[PDB]
Amino acid sequence: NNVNDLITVTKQMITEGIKDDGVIQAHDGEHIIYTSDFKIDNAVKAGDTMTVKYDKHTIPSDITDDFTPVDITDPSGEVIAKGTFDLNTKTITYKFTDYVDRYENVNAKLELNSYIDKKEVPNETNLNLTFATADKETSKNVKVEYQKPIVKDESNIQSIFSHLDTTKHEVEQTIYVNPLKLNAKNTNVTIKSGGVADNGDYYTGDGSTIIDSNTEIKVYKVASGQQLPQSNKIYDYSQYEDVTNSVTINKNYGTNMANINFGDIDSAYIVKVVSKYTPGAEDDLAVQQGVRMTTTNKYNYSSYAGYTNTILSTTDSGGGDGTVKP
Amino acid sequence: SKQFTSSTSY
Ligand SMILES: [Mg+2]
């Protein structure tokens, strides 16, 4: 019962969530906003469906798996349509309720947020984004930019939050240690709740995590000819060398603070940390965790590099209205 | 509900 041909799109556009500069700052958490205004033909009836298509390179939620499309509701809360999302086709199917049997001259407005899908965009690139409402397409050219490591002599590090589970209250951090493959002497990495400044200085910050013996920490060695994705997200760990049992890990080094002793290294490593957080903290954006890399430089003192992640959120909207059928 | 992403603190 697809009625895309009965949906008339009167306005649609793609806009950037933080700054209109033609560049999606994906590691700054910059979202993409797709807005669509459309009319629903009077012939549309309960159970009929329409579709909304996201660009293949975008995804409604970057770090959670729990996306459910927002209802389309009228001003008093009547549900006009219920939506289901197919991740594989990047498509919402909206199914109309008997609202459309009781009202006519029905129109609706969708505001759908999305992020760069790191699986589809492993490295920086130019994209021609194309979104669609009921098969009516609109496009926007953008560049995707990712972050760079903080570099101080041979200390060089970067990290992202790569997953968030709001049911089990776990957050996953993916850390690139020495991505530049430098000769990093006496390498130690600290992971801590709250903040680590670019120069390694600790700060309390505005979020927290819980780090203890039940924190999960895995460490992988990257070969000299292996290239890490700029997205900072690893979807398959199988081609890297698991060296978790060959480095020293102290999950209780300090208060909510773990550290890893690497010694002298000449290679990049990936560290994946799964820590807990305070239930509900995601609604206050109060989940924050940082990393510090220390090495000994050629002048016999320590060089530090720091990196901190936090979370951002968006909320879709779907509204409509109509006049009562006599 | 909400949809989420990772960001950088500075
Ligand atoms: Mg921008």
Author numbering:
A (entry chain A): 3 to 328
B (entry chain C): 26 to 35
Publication passage describing the model:
The gene identified from chromosomal DNA isolated from S. aureus subsp. aureusTCH60 encodes bone sialoprotein-binding protein (Bbp) with 1149 amino acids, containing SD-repeats of 154 residues and the ligand-binding A region from 53 to 601 residues further divided into N1, N2 and N3 domains. S. aureus isolated from patients suffering from septic arthritis and osteomyelitis specifically interacts with bone sialoprotein (BSP), a noncollagenous protein of bone and dentine extracellular matrix, mediated by Bbp. As a bifunctional MSCRAMM, Bbp also recognizes the human Fg α chain and inhibits thrombin induced blood coagulation.
To study the molecular mechanism underlying Bbp-ligand recognition, Bbp273−598 was crystallized in complex with the ligand Fg α561−575. Each crystallographic asymmetric unit contains two independent Bbp273−598-Fg α561−575 molecules. The bound peptide Fg α561−575 threads into the groove between the N2 and N3 domains in a snug conformation, with a well-defined 2Fo-Fc electron density map observed for the residues Lys562–Ser569 of the N-terminus of the peptide. The disordered C-terminus encompassing residues Ser585–Pro598 in apo-Bbp273−598 rearranges in the Bbp273−598-Fg α561−575 structure. The connecting loop between the G′ and G′′ strands spanning residues Thr586-Gly589 runs across the central region of the groove and the following sequence forms a short β-strand G′′ which inserts into N2 domain, making regions BbpAsp338–Gly355 and BbpThr365–Tyr387 deviate significantly from the apo-form. In addition, the binding of the peptide also induces a reorganization of the region BbpAla298–Gly301 between the A and B strands in N2 domain and a large movement of the region BbpSer547–Gln561 between the E′ and F′ strands in N3 domain toward the peptide binding groove. Two newly formed α-helices are observed in both of the two regions. And then the G′′ strand forms compact interactions with the E strand in the region BbpThr365–Tyr387 of N2 domain, which “Latch” the ligand binding site and thus stabilize the overall structure.
